[PDB]
Symmetry: C2
Subunit: 405 residues, 2 copies
């Protein structure tokens, strides 16, 4: 940076702290990643100055010729990446992408069937303190209490009983492959739309390491900042038959001016994802997650569903008589960042929990491999088996530092 | 830029076109401005990598110590700038800022009273194709058909008749000072909340050139990218008594992860606005708008309300037998960017219109003054009085080029 240090010493100092923090810690938040310098440059461009309500070639402001090129690059590369008939790259966030789809096909009070929030479902999949659960009548399907895999007979029974207008598949904390074919079959049975929220798994889908929801879903929503490794924002994919309706839902429905600089950054991230090396990266994410899972089991930890098919895993800490809150706190003390997480049929509140959620997307981006996964698991074991030993915690601290250089 | 040119030639070429476009054109879109290099650097920072759901010191993710500092700088500087008891700097946009306030105090189907959309009111103030008009029952107050000033007796009558739960004041195309005291008096009479959407005038308010709505309104919403000259986004100001409710409306109500890099950029923009030179700038914006108004009248143009008290003006093109659409198109041909705009009691559709909307915030930022205002008015006169003369249009083109260097 050149201008920020002089203009705003306070903001610059805080940003610099954050930058150094991102290098020093072992970042295991499943939803996080590190974007490229190109992506950041796009976000830091003069495109923030441009009002561009509407869509390419159909704007409500003149002078959009070039931001049109940018948005179209984003849309076309997204369509290449996922094989979708239509893309809307304007959603400000995952929240707004989901909001727009709901706005398109539902009226206030309509019944929607989503994943149980304590079993992996997201806040925007029906929380009663979120717009989703306040605006619409959400019911939930669950995972099997033993396997922790989605119970498709439960999905089917809930759908047949409650007759939702929309079924939502996908999750913020589900460590196994989702069967989109079965979701569509159930949706077809009850005459419901199917929406898939692939936010967490979007990069994996792009790399062919998770089945693609696009052929099975009427709508696919996603964020651009998780496994897709792009800027912070949302996107909607859909068949051509819903394109007009989806576009109208975003604008003039639920948003105004799009963030053209962020859309530029989306285009850049999609360009990166189209490359062979992104596919290799995504494989290492999944490989690393399996390795970390196995290594954690070797340390004596129980994992939700007994492992992982994707980028993320959940540790069930009940055998160690620890809460997720306690584990999160102590791992923070040694420089390892995780989330506390509710496990299926968790006896604890969502504010305490019996689990931690871990993902490998971020550490994989920084070049961590299988050996690093073994060491991360060993450090977690050292810490969680010795929460009362300051010497153990200091050793962990030193081993964390050794990993991050 | 260093990394974008190599990584993504296509995106870089389009951004470069846009940058050069921003220099070449006379940008008169009332809602636009040019942000500083510091603001852009903040947006282009690694803060995009950080999930920070929740609020400073009360996050749902660890490792937020430094992004907390950034958000708090934004909130505290906003409170300094506007004298508000509470700020929420998380809204992704003006749309979401407004959405959050509505979510806080209204239930589905509640009556809201806003400014007539063809008289200056915004899309999010009750359009039937926007969430506002679909989710809530909007009624409208109008301006006087002769003076084009808000008819406060009409505000009062509509409020007393329809008994709204919320009254919205403020506008996307109102060229005069709004009387917030009178709005609060009417709101008090009918037991309604008052929300002021100061998006357009926020920079002017910060510089003491427009009365501050904060003391009169229960909620004040704004964008950060118009006269405030910040990054693209939203903000809500309110009294302490609504702070918890407003914060909960943004999260977990209507959004997820905030854009921490954009929040950094907001902090920077607020820092700039706190400086003496921003106050001088804002005065020049208003001075330039008055000068441009007077110069346009000298050219024989009729202005909505007969002039301006702020950054923007509307030309009523009916005396010239031109539509706003025609004027917008031909001005585009010579390198002047305006919007077509509905005038009060416009005989034309909102897609054709009888007016153009012009603002001086952007040209003032690039250093234009009173002499430049005279020339801009003279060029507009030359063009709009000679729409069929290619030689006149080429002369205009050359005079536009002379202004932008």
């Amino acid at each position: 940076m050149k201008y920020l240090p002089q203009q705003d010493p306070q903001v610059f100092a805080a940003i610099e702290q954050e930058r150094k923090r991102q290098h020093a810690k072992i970042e295991l938040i499943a939803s996080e990643n590190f974007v490229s310098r190109a992506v950041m440059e796009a976000q830091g461009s003069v495109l923030t100055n441009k009002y561009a309500e509407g869509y390419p070639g159909r704007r409500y402001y003149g002078g959009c010729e070039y931001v049109d090129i940018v948005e179209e690059l984003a849309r076309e590369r997204a369509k290449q990446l996922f094989g979708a008939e239509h893309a809307n790259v304007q959603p400000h966030s995952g929240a707004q992408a989901n909001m727009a789809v709901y706005f398109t096909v539902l009226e206030h009070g309509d019944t929607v069937l989503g994943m149980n929030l304590s079993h992996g479902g997201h806040l925007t999949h029906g929380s009663p303190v979120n717009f989703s659960g306040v605006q619409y009548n959400f019911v939930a399907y669950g995972v099997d209490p033993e396997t922790h895999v989605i119970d498709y007979d439960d999905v089917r029974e809930k759908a047949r009983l409650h007759r939702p207008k929309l079924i939502v598949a996908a999750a913020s904390a589900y460590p196994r492959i989702i069967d989109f074919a079965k979701f569509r079959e159930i949706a077809d049975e009850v005459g419901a739309y199917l929406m898939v929220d692939m936010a967490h798994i979007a990069g994996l889908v792009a790399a062919g390491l998770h089945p693609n929801p696009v052929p099975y879903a009427h709508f696919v929503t996603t964020t651009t900042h998780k496994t897709l490794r792009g800027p912070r924002g949302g996107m909607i994919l859909c068949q051509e038959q819903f394109a007009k309706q989806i576009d109208k839902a975003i604008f003039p429905g639920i948003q105004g001016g799009p963030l053209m600089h962020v859309i530029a950054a989306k285009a850049v991230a999609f360009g990166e994802a189209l490359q062979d090396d992104f596919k290799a990266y995504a494989k290492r994410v999944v490989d690393n997650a399996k390795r970390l899972a196995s290594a954690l089991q070797n340390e004596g930890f129980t994992l939700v569903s007994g492992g992982t098919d994707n980028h993320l895993l959940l540790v069930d800490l009940r055998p160690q008589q620890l809460t997720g809150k306690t584990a999160e706190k102590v791992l923070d003390e040694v420089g390892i960042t995780v989330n506390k997480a509710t496990i299926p049929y968790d006896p604890e509140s969502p504010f305490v929990t019996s689990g931690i959620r871990i993902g490998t997307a971020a550490v994989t981006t920084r070049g961590f491999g299988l050996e690093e996964m073994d060491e991360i698991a060993a450090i977690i074991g050292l810490v969680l088996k010795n929460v009362g030993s300051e010497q153990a915690l200091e050793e962990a601290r030193q081993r964390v530092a050794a990993l991050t250089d």
